[PDB]
Amino acid sequence: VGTFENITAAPADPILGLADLFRADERPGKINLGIGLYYDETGKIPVLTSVKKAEQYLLENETTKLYLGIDGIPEFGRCTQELLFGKGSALINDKRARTAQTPGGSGALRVAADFLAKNTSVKRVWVSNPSWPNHKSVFNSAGLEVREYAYYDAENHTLDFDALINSLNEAQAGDVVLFHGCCHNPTGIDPTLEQWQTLAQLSVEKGWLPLFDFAYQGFARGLEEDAEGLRAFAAMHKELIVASSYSKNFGLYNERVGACTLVAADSETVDRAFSQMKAAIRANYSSPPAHGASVVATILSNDALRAIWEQELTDMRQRIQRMRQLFVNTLQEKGANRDFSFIIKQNGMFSFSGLTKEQVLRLREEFGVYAVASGRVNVAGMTPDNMAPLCEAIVAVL
Amino acid sequence: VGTFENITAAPADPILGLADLFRADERPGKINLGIGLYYDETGKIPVLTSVKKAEQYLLENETTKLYLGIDGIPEFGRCTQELLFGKGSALINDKRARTAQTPGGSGALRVAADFLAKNTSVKRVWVSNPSWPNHKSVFNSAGLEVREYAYYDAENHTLDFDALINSLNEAQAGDVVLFHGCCHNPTGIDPTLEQWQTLAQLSVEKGWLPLFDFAYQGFARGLEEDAEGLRAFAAMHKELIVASSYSKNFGLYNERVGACTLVAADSETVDRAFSQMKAAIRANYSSPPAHGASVVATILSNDALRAIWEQELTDMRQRIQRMRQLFVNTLQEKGANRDFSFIIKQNGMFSFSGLTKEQVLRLREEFGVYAVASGRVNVAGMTPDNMAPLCEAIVAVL
Ligand SMILES: Cc1ncc(COP(=O)(O)O)c(C=O)c1O
Ligand SMILES: Cc1ncc(COP(=O)(O)O)c(C=O)c1O
């Protein structure tokens, strides 16, 4: 009697399964608007110049591949805290935060989930509906219940703040509430500063533990501005957790560079808690991969490389905003009667197109255009060369 | 009332806690025989030449960092299966095996444990007494019970084959039994081929699911020879799991390069099982880090680089063998009256020294010689320059 005989096949990942269909499609002119990769104006996914410079430096100067500590490169953790909280933050001066280098933002989310499930009485995590599909899997893998809160007004293409507030009414003291720090995935709709401040006050009154997922810092307005919501929470909370990723804003997707940051009331408490976070990492992958995080730490700690990187990040933010405008314009030019102007108000790589599952299927099967079944399209996959055919396809299924 | 306030500090890792103490130790003569790192004759922990050359190729030819698939680089998987099972194996031609690239051997162990606990009826894993200390933590954290079988005869410094087989008669069908492929950690004592064949037959009769941990392929006798015990299992079993590591045989510790290989009765079953292993990876770190695995796959797939690497591995293995001999001879010269000849018959980086916990504590506090509290010593940390002080210290505590 085989152990593997009773196993049920896993469903296809809603995002990665799509990219597998795309790689199999033999039809010429297929267009990939699925997975969240940054493409340049020629349809390629390049390595940043700042990253190549840093990798050259590492090649010439690394003398050993000796294991990192469980929590990773120390300079990486410190530069990360400055990015998130600000160079002179009280949180850093009071030594209230500890950061672990992790394998991507995904790995940072799993490390937090394992830590919470094993060392606290947290039973429940609240996630926006919609959210990144993998959020539920990560927290469920540690045995945590995941509930959903309302977020998106699909009528006005706006944040439904009233429904958000009402739907979080039953989130209890000691529940985790997950917020996207900026560039909400998939809607591209973020709270305003005043909405963030309102959420911060309510969180402290209700006793929630906030967990911020930061995968797109620098893609909305700028590095400092995109962190304003987080910093409004950090000014008011004793405790919070930040999972952050450098996959997107350094174009380091496949090197798995992220961080999990813990904040507690004081230095002694966060050190105690962090020692249990390190134990959860040790029972998982033991210590994190060095190459990607070394690149990031090299760039952030060298003024000249850092200035190259900040300009590269700006050029990527601006290309995406330009494509958002060109998309709306070309849809009108190609004859759409539906108003797509809301696309211009959305932030980051993704917008909710408002297409139905049926229309997304038609686009894939009839026109070779690949989006996620929720209607999320990757605007950063749009180029001046593929824009007209893409828009003709959409207009055809409207 | 903070969520983190009542968390208890985690105890130190028996291996990584020692490394921290050693780093902080201010004495210039300190000697590190704890963590399993390869040192060259001069006390350095070098990057291999094959690896530097492969990294230079990657630097100049890499055009993108786009995500690998969940299971990683395909050539890496194929080359791993060839090393494990042999260039013309029936497991491979029958398409009975699927491999996922993982963040180290540690990550491969957690992926297997998550996959087992979430998709099968397995409740119990059997691990040798003694074993690598992190084995229990990994399987306990996935929710599996850990049971110990007998292995080492401490009086005779030998494998107690009878005790082992008696202990394992309590293991039931559908339990997982974990075997070290070669260079048993910490004892350095491995089954002979005959004993492997005996366990393999006994394994099918009782219905165990074998799990091989293969972190030292090439450090006992040779690449092919060190897999004989696994290949005897593979010829008889419908199902098995191998977690393997390239940290040590490539000196790639901090890049986290390993693999989890699943074997099932046929191609249809292993694909069904592998789909759930991918789901378990997706909810952990999503996809594995590219740099380290790309280096390995570049080396194994290029005949000139492979030849360099295979010579560098031979040199490491022989250097360790020369140190085992030198250690025994120098102990007698420095006035030890115990017979340490058993060290010569142990394989790999580690010997079980027979020192007590109290003697190990003295070696550290009074002499700055760092060994694990079990008395395991890293022979690969021994050099001609530190042999005399190390042996004088040991004689002083007998
Ligand atoms: C909201 C959110 N969190 C986490 C991630 C995962 O990032 P990473 O590739 O660093 O694991 C993504 C993007 O993939 C994301 O959009
Ligand atoms: C038996 C055994 N399994 C697994 C590992 C973990 O290897 P890695 O560093 O690749 O995670 C080690 C040592 O590191 C080991 O000795």
Short mmCIF file of C-alpha atoms in Angstrom, two decimals, chain A residues 184-328:
data_model
loop_
_atom_site.label_atom_id
_atom_site.label_comp_id
_atom_site.label_asym_id
_atom_site.label_seq_id
_atom_site.Cartn_x
_atom_site.Cartn_y
_atom_site.Cartn_z
CA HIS A 184 -2.44 47.32 -3.46
CA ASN A 185 -2.40 44.00 -5.32
CA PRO A 186 -4.59 43.57 -7.32
CA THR A 187 -6.56 46.80 -7.32
CA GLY A 188 -3.86 49.49 -7.32
CA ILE A 189 -6.11 51.47 -4.93
CA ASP A 190 -4.37 52.67 -1.76
CA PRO A 191 -5.72 54.53 1.28
CA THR A 192 -5.04 58.23 1.39
CA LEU A 193 -2.94 59.59 4.23
CA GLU A 194 -6.09 60.63 6.10
CA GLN A 195 -7.57 57.15 5.63
CA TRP A 196 -4.33 55.55 6.89
CA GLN A 197 -4.42 57.77 9.98
CA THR A 198 -8.03 56.79 10.63
CA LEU A 199 -7.13 53.12 10.28
CA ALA A 200 -4.17 53.58 12.64
CA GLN A 201 -6.35 55.05 15.38
CA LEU A 202 -8.98 52.34 14.99
CA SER A 203 -6.36 49.59 15.05
CA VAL A 204 -4.98 50.81 18.39
CA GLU A 205 -8.45 51.15 19.93
CA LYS A 206 -9.46 47.64 18.81
CA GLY A 207 -6.15 46.01 19.77
CA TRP A 208 -5.26 44.60 16.39
CA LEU A 209 -1.77 43.44 15.49
CA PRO A 210 -0.98 45.11 12.15
CA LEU A 211 1.06 43.21 9.57
CA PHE A 212 2.21 45.24 6.57
CA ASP A 213 3.11 43.53 3.29
CA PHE A 214 5.51 45.88 1.45
CA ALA A 215 6.38 44.52 -1.97
CA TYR A 216 6.29 47.72 -4.08
CA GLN A 217 7.95 50.53 -2.14
CA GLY A 218 8.83 53.25 -4.66
CA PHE A 219 6.29 52.29 -7.32
CA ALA A 220 3.42 54.59 -6.23
CA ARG A 221 4.96 58.03 -5.65
CA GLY A 222 8.47 57.61 -4.19
CA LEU A 223 10.43 55.72 -1.57
CA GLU A 224 9.57 57.96 1.39
CA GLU A 225 6.03 58.82 0.32
CA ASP A 226 5.04 55.18 -0.17
CA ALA A 227 5.97 54.48 3.46
CA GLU A 228 3.75 57.22 4.93
CA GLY A 229 0.94 54.82 5.82
CA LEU A 230 3.30 52.46 7.63
CA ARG A 231 4.90 55.36 9.50
CA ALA A 232 1.50 56.58 10.63
CA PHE A 233 0.90 53.15 12.17
CA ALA A 234 4.41 52.99 13.64
CA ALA A 235 3.94 56.31 15.43
CA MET A 236 0.99 54.83 17.34
CA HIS A 237 1.56 51.09 17.81
CA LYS A 238 3.63 49.22 20.36
CA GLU A 239 3.76 46.10 18.15
CA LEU A 240 3.74 45.45 14.43
CA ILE A 241 5.25 43.21 11.74
CA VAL A 242 6.47 44.25 8.28
CA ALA A 243 7.14 41.76 5.49
CA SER A 244 9.04 43.52 2.73
CA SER A 245 10.38 42.48 -0.66
CA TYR A 246 13.16 43.72 -2.93
CA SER A 247 12.06 41.48 -5.80
CA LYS A 248 10.31 44.23 -7.71
CA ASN A 249 12.09 47.46 -6.86
CA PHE A 250 15.55 45.94 -7.50
CA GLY A 251 14.49 43.57 -10.29
CA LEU A 252 15.98 40.75 -8.19
CA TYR A 253 12.97 38.41 -8.43
CA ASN A 254 14.80 35.10 -8.62
CA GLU A 255 17.42 35.80 -5.93
CA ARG A 256 14.74 35.84 -3.16
CA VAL A 257 15.55 38.99 -1.20
CA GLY A 258 13.12 40.07 1.48
CA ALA A 259 12.92 40.89 5.15
CA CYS A 260 10.71 40.28 8.14
CA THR A 261 10.79 43.11 10.69
CA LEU A 262 9.41 42.78 14.23
CA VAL A 263 8.54 45.80 16.39
CA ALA A 264 7.72 45.50 20.09
CA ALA A 265 7.28 47.85 23.01
CA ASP A 266 10.93 47.96 24.01
CA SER A 267 14.34 46.53 23.31
CA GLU A 268 14.17 43.64 25.77
CA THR A 269 10.78 42.43 24.49
CA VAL A 270 11.69 42.51 20.80
CA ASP A 271 14.93 40.65 21.50
CA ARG A 272 13.01 37.90 23.32
CA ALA A 273 10.45 37.64 20.53
CA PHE A 274 13.11 37.75 17.84
CA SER A 275 14.91 34.79 19.40
CA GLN A 276 11.76 32.74 18.68
CA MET A 277 11.56 34.10 15.14
CA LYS A 278 15.13 32.85 14.64
CA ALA A 279 14.06 29.43 15.93
CA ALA A 280 11.25 29.34 13.36
CA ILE A 281 13.75 30.14 10.58
CA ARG A 282 16.17 27.48 11.82
CA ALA A 283 13.49 24.76 11.52
CA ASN A 284 12.69 25.94 7.97
CA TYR A 285 15.64 26.89 5.69
CA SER A 286 18.16 27.59 8.51
CA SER A 287 19.87 30.67 7.01
CA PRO A 288 18.99 32.87 4.03
CA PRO A 289 20.65 33.09 0.61
CA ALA A 290 23.50 35.58 0.47
CA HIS A 291 23.88 36.77 -3.15
CA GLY A 292 20.71 38.83 -3.60
CA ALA A 293 20.82 40.46 -0.17
CA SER A 294 24.54 41.23 -0.60
CA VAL A 295 23.69 43.10 -3.79
CA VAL A 296 20.99 45.14 -2.04
CA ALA A 297 23.19 45.93 0.97
CA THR A 298 26.04 46.97 -1.33
CA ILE A 299 23.83 49.35 -3.31
CA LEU A 300 22.08 50.87 -0.28
CA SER A 301 25.35 51.46 1.59
CA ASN A 302 27.25 53.08 -1.32
CA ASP A 303 26.16 56.64 -2.14
CA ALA A 304 27.12 56.37 -5.81
CA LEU A 305 25.42 53.04 -6.44
CA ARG A 306 22.38 54.12 -4.45
CA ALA A 307 21.90 57.19 -6.64
CA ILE A 308 22.05 55.05 -9.79
CA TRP A 309 19.44 52.71 -8.29
CA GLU A 310 17.08 55.51 -7.25
CA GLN A 311 17.09 56.87 -10.80
CA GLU A 312 16.52 53.40 -12.25
CA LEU A 313 13.56 52.93 -9.90
CA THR A 314 12.19 56.33 -10.98
CA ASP A 315 12.47 55.41 -14.65
CA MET A 316 10.47 52.25 -13.99
CA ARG A 317 7.78 54.09 -12.02
CA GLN A 318 7.47 56.65 -14.79
CA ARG A 319 7.31 54.13 -17.63
CA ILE A 320 4.38 52.43 -15.90
CA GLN A 321 2.49 55.72 -15.41
CA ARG A 322 3.09 56.59 -19.07
CA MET A 323 1.71 53.20 -20.10
CA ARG A 324 -1.39 53.73 -17.92
CA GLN A 325 -2.10 56.92 -19.87
CA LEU A 326 -1.37 55.35 -23.28
CA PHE A 327 -3.63 52.36 -22.46
CA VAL A 328 -6.64 54.58 -21.72
#
